[PDB]
Structure formats: structure tokens, C-alpha cells
Amino acid sequence: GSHMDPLMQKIDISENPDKIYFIRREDGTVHRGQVLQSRTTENAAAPDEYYVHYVGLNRRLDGWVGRHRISDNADDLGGITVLPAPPLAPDQ
């Protein structure tokens, strides 16, 4: 949460627009979605939202989604539409 890495400067679209991005829905069920735009709010030092267009899914569903929801890999999101077992308060 400080100083943007010289590479992790938010996912770049101009490289694979066709590439389908996965987005974890609020309920939890992850679903495909094409990203077209993105904005880092006024602050522009942490905030950032990507416009997602769920493929096949209702157009109304389309909107803005936080970076945390979008990910190139599904496993990170929800392991392919599956809720991960809640941690029993892990601590050494």
C-alpha cells in the first residue's frame, strides 16, 4: 500500500483486449467478463475500477468492478465458482 511497483501499475488492457477476464461476483460465484475501461478515481494512488462485460450474461449486469474481483486466474477468485472453506482462525 505504498509506491507502485515498476510493473504492477494496474493491469494493462492495450495488450490483449480480446483476452477474457474472470470476475468474482459478490455472491461469490466467479464468471467470465470482458474488461474495456478502468479509472483510478481522483486520488490515483490506490483506487482503480475496471469496466466488466460479462460474456453471455445479461447486459444490465455489466458495470464497474474492483480490481480485487477481476483476475486473470480463476483459482485465485473462487476456484471455478466454488466458495473456499472458511479459515478456522489460523495462527502459529
Q: The C-alpha cell of 31 is what?
A: 464468471
Q: The C-alpha cell of 87 is what?
A: 479459515
**Cα 84 to Cα 58: distance, rounded to the nearest angstrom:** 26
Q: How was this structure determined?
A: NMR
Report the candidate in 41, 70, 68, 39 with the shortest Cα–Cα distance to residue 53.
70
Contacts of residues 71-74 at CB distance under 8 Å and 24 or more positions apart, as own/partner, are 71/21, 71/22, 71/23, 71/24, 72/11, 72/19, 72/21, 72/22, 73/22, 74/22, 74/30
Q: The C-alpha cell of 23 is what?
A: 470476475
Q: Which CATH number fits domain 1-92: 2.60.40.10, 3.30.1330.30, 2.30.30.140, 3.40.640.10?
A: 2.30.30.140
- What would the DSSP string read from start to end of 8-75? -SS--STT-TTSPEEEE-TTS-EEEEEEEEEE-TTT-SS--EEEEE-SSS-TTT-EEEETTTEES-HH
φ, ψ dihedrals at 32, nearest 5°: -55, 155
